C-alpha cells in the first residue's frame, strides 16, 4: 500500500507483555559458535 502511514505509530502498549512463553527455547543452536 503506497498510502499507508509511513511513520512509527504511537498509542501502543508501552509496557512489558506478560503473555509470553516463560520456558526455555529448545529450538536454539546447540553447537559451539565459530564466529
Amino acid at each position, epitope marked *: 500500500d*503506497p498510502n499507508a502511514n*509511513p511513520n*512509527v505509530d504511537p498509542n501502543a502498549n508501552p509496557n512489558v507483555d506478560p503473555n509470553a512463553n516463560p520456558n526455555v527455547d529448545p529450538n536454539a543452536n546447540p553447537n559451539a559458535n565459530p564466529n
Partner: antibody
Amino acid sequence: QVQLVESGGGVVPPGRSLRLSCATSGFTFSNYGMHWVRQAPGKGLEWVAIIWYDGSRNFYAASVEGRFTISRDNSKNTLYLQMNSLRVEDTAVYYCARAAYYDTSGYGDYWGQGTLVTVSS
Amino acid sequence: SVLTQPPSVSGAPGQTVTISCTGGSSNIGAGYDVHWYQQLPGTAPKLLIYGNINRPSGVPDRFSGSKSGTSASLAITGLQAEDEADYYCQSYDRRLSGSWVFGGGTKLTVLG
C-alpha cells in the same frame, strides 16, 4: 529545528551510477519515514520514492523502478538514494523530505536544501 | 500530471486572487486530501496548506483554501511583493503506485 542537508551530486556521463545522500538533524530520524523528490530545470516536481521508518516498505515511481534504490541507516541519521544507469532524463534537482500523514494522504512538513545532478555527454 | 493547474495567474497588489487545482474521480473526488506548497525562486518548496484548511505556524493568515467535489483551490488575499512564487497542489492518485502526485504548478505574478 529540522535540518536536512544533501550532498553527492555533480556531473556524470550517462550509463553509469551516482550516489546521493540526505543528512538529518534536529528530530528523531528513526521515528519518521523519508521521501526523495526531483525537479527538472524549468519544470515542476515529480515524486521519486518513499521508505518506511523501519525500512521494510520501499515504493518507487514507475519511471525509476528497477534503477533507483533507496536506503537508510538509522545509526547515522543519513538517507541514501542509489542511482544506477543514469539517463539524460534524470538530470534534476533532488530534494529529501520528511513524511507526514494527515487523514488519508501524505505530505512533507520539512524539506532539504536540495542538490543538482547532471547527466550529459 | 494528473492534477491540472492554470499556467500563470496575476493580480494587483492588495486584491484577492485564487489558484485552482482540478483533478478527477481518482485523486481529489475519491475522498483524499489536497496539500499546497509554495516554492520561492531560489529555495526548496515550503509547506503552505495541509488538510485542505490547515496551515503551519510560518504561513501567515492571508493564505487559505478549500475543496469540494473533484475541485480544490487556494485563495490568496492582500497580494504582497514577496508572494511571487510557484504554487503546487498535491494529492494521491488511486490509479498509480506513488504516494504523492503533483500538479503542473501555477506562477503567481504581482503587478506592483
